[model samples]
Target: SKSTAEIRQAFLDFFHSKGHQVVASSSLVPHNDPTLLFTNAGMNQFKDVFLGLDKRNYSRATTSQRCVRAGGKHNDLENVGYTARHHTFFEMLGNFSFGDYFKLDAILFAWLLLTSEKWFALPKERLWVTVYESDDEAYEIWEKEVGIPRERIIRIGDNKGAPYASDNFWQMGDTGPCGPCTEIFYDHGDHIWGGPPGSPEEDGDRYIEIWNIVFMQFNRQADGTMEPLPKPSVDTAMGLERIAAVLQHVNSNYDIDLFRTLIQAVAKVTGATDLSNKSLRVIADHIRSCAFLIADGVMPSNENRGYVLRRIIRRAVRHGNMLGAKETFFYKLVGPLIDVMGSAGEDLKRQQAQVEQVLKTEEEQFARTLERGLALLDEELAKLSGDTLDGETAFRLYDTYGFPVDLTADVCRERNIKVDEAGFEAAMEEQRRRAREASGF
Candidate 1:
């Protein structure tokens, strides 16, 4: 019913109308912060507020925040581009109440965002809401108070849907304000397979999550117990691009209005007219992330954040290669990125020059590195003619050269250097078990 900017302002203004003191975004946090390397969510700034470590004159606030999701437990690394709804550096539109408001207003606001015509236009029949079933207050808000029928309300178990394992839990890291959460899922349609929203694993394309609402009610201890936080809080992150796609009646986030403009700009360099597809998808999603990271002062290197940026940039270049583009052309796409996102995100505009500089430098670096890496891989494949590639050699290539194991398998496809699937697994498992035993997270 409204434009993307209108939708963003609507949420901020809605909460602000309800007395949230809207605030500015924090600097993209330094990685070496004692606990976390990157800011993963909008609520991270209020960690001190949640822990009662400190507080400002005002506690309640709302922000359209920049977030990096590429490290630690919150890492969305493997899912980028491979899935339609994952991102590295994305916006988290959130509201925070550092003990100012509790569950009622937060619940009511969420209910409106979901059900009201002024917000998301989805019908009640197709939408679903999940709450921490163990928390009776949350359960009552959704069922008895919020009018969600009992059957549609699924009470997920502690580990499965509970805030524990990586699958469904929400935590800031080793220590901070944490709590149970309610997530909203949107049906992605039967594009993958033909199934309903709650189908069994083999069924159609079911519900894909579109937003996460974290009710920060407790603190996670080193002993892994939920200690009641001094100040209860509410933090929400809705995927801006994902929501835009649904609102614009498109099938994927890349096709949304924001990315559409970036895709057109990328096509100018890659020279592919069909820019709204997956190739452009990688470039568009990645270029902004790459730019922000480089601008934030991370450079191309072989470890940690540097490696992460390298992987993101090189991966985009690799995809562009598949789309029949030549040497380092995606760098030009960054010019269009600042044009499209600069108005809304000044940091993007500020770092555009450096982001381009690093990406262009890294592209040439990766091209040579990849060429040499592939050549060496071919030599290894030549050396191995039988049904075995050394587990350590494969591991070395993956760890050192960043040659994915599957890519190794692909190059050895005709050479008959079959991989010992079990051997590789044993080596990997052993390393992980050792790492787990080494120290605490």
Candidate 2:
């Protein structure tokens, strides 16, 4: 099996062979979009070309983009360690057509890349596909062009009736370039526990969507209608970690080669056993996002991006504590992270000291109140008879004990309950004047 680095290079190499220019990933910080929390996709850097606001020297491009999806909606942080696939921080391997290539060629490139003897050569037997319910065009392309069996191809739509549905129709906002999409799912087999897309058991880990090919064939409008683009474009992305697991014969992304070294380092620090542990996976996953976010120049703090960074840091610390880590172990994973990252991590390696400092400082700051807060929160969670933890308790935890509202909320969520933020805020507001009068009283 190829290393994760080799896979990334092979992706770029393959695309380069097809007349696409290789573009280096941009910063995690979005260059112009203020509304976005972070660079959430490989398409972030190419938004200008798709929207027609800017032009590029080339019509086709490929990139291995660094992305963060921790804070935004349509995301659940709780699934991080428990699931076979997901990460707050992961690389997205993408090929962009910029109106140069559309459906048939995009599908051809993806199928060839996955099944050809020279490329990944994934088994045809284990593969499945999904197309938009209304898209007979994409449906035919998969069956006729790619030779995918008609039975294995499932046609789905904007899964409204079933919220768990993976919407096969792709759109960029309420309006703009939008179209039907086709996604490839690899069956990890009966030994695992999942079904194909749109099925009730689809959420299980048995089947995974390895790649998505979108046909940017329509221009959607604000009046609840659609217009076709003159020269339709193509935008596609595959999670590097997800594909890594499929290629490596591992069931979980945490079991992939890139994470093995990080998990080993985490286990060493936390005294976790050789057997796979949930906390170890979370800690391992957290280090990458936290380190990369810091390397990209975001720090832990009380505001927007920083707060998201801080919450992740706190979450990792809590998990570390669960594993009996007696001292600061979170920051120590930086060196191990850089080791698996290969070249891109070399950037984090250059600023290792700076990255280490912020990680160390954040953990140490939380360390003073860390254990105390956890014991108290658990105690409160036990005492709760109803569904909600009072805002005053949450406020007390946040105020003097250094717990964030989100952290308390995160804990309560696992207990299958709720947190009273409104009550906490009312208590919080009453303390504003007193807060200035005294510190942490």
Candidate 3:
């Protein structure tokens, strides 16, 4: 079996052989665009070209972009440990045709590269595709040019009589270059679902979407009008880890070599190997994201990207606490993560010490705060007569003890007690009012 690193290189090599410029992945942090918090897409760096604001030397490019979807429309934080496909941090292997190509070539390239035995060697029968409800051009190309069966082509919004913006269409935001998209799905097997390949119950678990080819041909105005762009562009994004799962014949992305190695190391560090525990999955997935974020020069802080970083570290620390792991063991996992991903970038190896230092410091700070919060929480519970935890008490735990509201809720839940979330919000609003008053606004 090919390793994750080898699979990643194979993608770039295939695109490079097609005369596409091989560009290195950009930082997780966005480049001074207040509209975005993190680089959530491979096309983000090249968005200016789509808007006709700038030009590049090369029209065709390929990159494995570092993306974080923990915030905004693409937020996957709540789904991370609970699901097989969602992730906060992921690498998007993408091929771009700025103005050099359009639908036909884009469709053919994806099909050729994905189905060719020389590349992925995925079984052709296991593949299915979906197109925009009204995209006759895409449907024609898929059936006529790509030779995919017409019956296997699922239309996103046809049955519903409306455009399925979430699946059929792609857009940068409320306004920008937007258009129809074609998605490629790999069928795991009928045994997993007990149904046929194109069944209605074909949710993500069985028919995992591996690739998306975005046909960027329209500019959505602020008024929600769709106007044709001067030049059509091709922007495609394929999840590297997701593809690894398919290629390696694994059901979950966490089972891939890249993550399995890390998960095994985590089990050793925490002394727990029960896959059912959410904490195990949380730690394995989070540490990888945390390591990459640090390598990209993101530090733990209380705002924006830094705040996201801090939350991930603290959550990892809290999950570590669940398995009796302590004192910067979460920081220790970074070394192995860097080792596994070293082939992707050496910068991670160089920044290994810094990543450990930042995680250690943040973990220590949170540990101290957590200890104090737990102590205060225990004392409050002792004084409480009813099962309901008062808002003031919970607010104090947040305000004075630096405890997260969710943390307080989780603790109360374990004790069969309820938290007054409304009261906590009221107290928070009162505090904000006082601050505003003190500022003489």
Candidate 4:
């Protein structure tokens, strides 16, 4: 079995052999695009090329883009540990044809790399695919050209009024390089209950998306109008972690080689015995996002991306506290992260001192407040007799100890206690109103 580094290497080399420039990954921060909070896609650095504003010397490109998504537009921060597939930071292996290739070649390239014995060699029988509802060309190519069984191909729509990001309607935001996509799904196993795409049970984890290929043709406007681009392009992305899980014969992404090492290191250092513990998973999951955020020049603060980084750090620290960690443990895990990540950590390795310093400083600051808040809540919970905690107490935890209401709620959940979220909101509003009066605003 090929390691992650080899897999990434094969992907780029394959495309490079076929006339694609292996471009370097851009910064995590989309500093030029104020509309975006972080770089979430492989094509982000080429946003101008898709928009016809800038041009690259080569029309064909392939890259293993380093992507981070915690808050803002494509936020996956809350779902990190709870789900098997979610990660705040991941490497996106993408191949792009500015105008050289379209659907047929795109699908051909994907199948060759995925199912061909010479490449990653995922079993064709376990694979499924989904196409845009009206994309007859792609559908026919899958059936006639690729010989994909007709029954296995699913035709899906925009999933109108769907969640943050949908299947077919793949786009950056309400506006910008929008397009219809065809997704490749890999069945993990029969033990996992899930149906093919567009089915009611499609949302289940049994069949997870391994790759997404978008036919870039439309440029959406702010007023919700879709205008065709000057030229059609192909931009496809495969989640390196998700595909790694499949190739490595693991069901969960956390069970893959990369995460297994990180989690073991986390457990070993924290003296945590339950390797399967949710808090352990959360801590391990957050290590990548927070460290990568710091490596890419983000710091803990009260606004924007910095604040997102702070939330992750504090959340991980709280989990550390839950696990009986005495001092700073998160910074220590950075050493293991750099170790197991292969050459991917090269950039982060250079910034190790700076990253560790930032983590240590932030964790030290939050350690006392975390203890004070958890103790206060534990004492308060001991005296309470109801299933729900008082909103004022929740607000006090938030205002005084820097515990976000949800963080307080996270503690109450294990004890089967609920937080009076509405009541907390009212108290929060009252405080805001008082502040307004005090300022004469």
Name the top TM-score candidate.
4
TM-score of each: 0.83, 0.91, 0.89, 0.94
Give each model's whole-structure lDDT. 0.71, 0.85, 0.82, 0.87
| Superior candidate under lDDT, 1 versus 4 | 4
**lDDT for predicted candidate 4 compared with the true structure:** 0.87
Error of 1 at 369 (Å): 2.4
Backbone collision count in every prediction? 4, 1, 0, 0
| Candidate 4 lDDT tens digits, 115-190 | 9988888889889999888889989999999998998899987576653245776888767897888999998888
In model 2, the runs with Cα more than 4 Å from the true position are 73-76, 161-166, 171-178, 217-231, 413-417, 421-441
Model 2 TM: 0.91
Instruction: Itemize residue pairs with steric clashes in candidate 3.
Output: none
By lDDT, is 1 or 3 better?
Answer: 3
Model 4 reaches what TM-score against the true structure?
Answer: 0.94
Better of 1 and 4 by TM-score: 4
Least accurate stretch of 10 residues (summed lDDT) in model 2?
157-166
Q: Ten-residue segment with the worst summed lDDT in candidate 4? A: 157-166
lDDT of 3 by residue, 112-162 (tens): 888997879899988889988788999999889888897788877634344
- Candidate numbers sorted by lDDT from highest down: 4, 2, 3, 1
